[PDB]
Amino acid sequence: PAVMNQALAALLQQTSADIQEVTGMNRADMA
Amino acid sequence: VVDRQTGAVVALNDLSVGRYDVTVDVGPSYTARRDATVSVLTNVLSSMLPTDPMRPAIQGIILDNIDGEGLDDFKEYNRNQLLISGIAKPRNEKEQQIVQQ
Amino acid sequence: TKLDEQFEKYPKFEINKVATELNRIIAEYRNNRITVKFRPGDREASEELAN
């Protein structure tokens, strides 16, 4: 049966985290 | 005895005066004297009970040294209130003969 | 590289992560701007001069 290589899963997780990370005294904390 | 002054055409250093009676210490650095006065008076305050009698005098003295724009009338009113209470010691120009009278 | 008689280039992805703290510092400054202030002295007319 079909398999999922670990590189693809790692890339999925890393890209998902990086999208949220890059795209963002109380007012100054807001983006 | 209430004034300390030096005078000379070219500064005269009297070798017979001797060592002064001051001690070298360290403290916070202030840009102006008003800052030092306000800081020391505020430190004196906030350790006194709200019912203490001299607290209004401390507050008046503190407010006398506050500087800002558009505070002429308020400062004059506070100074008059302090003068009529025998705390300001009129500086012998017009209020020693008008406000005190 | 040549890569079988061509010039395909290496993929060069960019994920900028060093600008967040710089933006935070810039926003911190722009939230509380500072200017020049003149303090009075111990004179009868220094207050009006400073004003």
B64 within 8 A of B78, measured Cβ to Cβ = yes
Q: How many CB atoms neighbour CB B90 within 10 A? A: 14
Read off the tokens for B31. Answer: 């840009």
To the nearest whole Å, the CA of C20 is away from the closest chain A CA by 8
**Two tokens at B37?**
């006065």
Look at chain A and count its residues.
31
CA distance B5 to B25: 23
Residues 6 or more apart in contact with residue C51 via CB below 8 angstroms: B69
- Experimental technique used to determine this entry: cryo-EM
Task: Measure the CA–CA gap between B42 and C18, rounded to whole angstroms.
Answer: 44
Nearest Cα of chain C lies from the Cα of A1 at a distance, in angstroms, of 32
B and A touch with 3+ CB pairs <8 Å, answer no
User: Which residues in chain C are contacts of A18 at CB distance < 8 A?
Assistant: 15, 17
Measure the CA–CA gap between B98 and B96, rounded to whole angstroms: 6
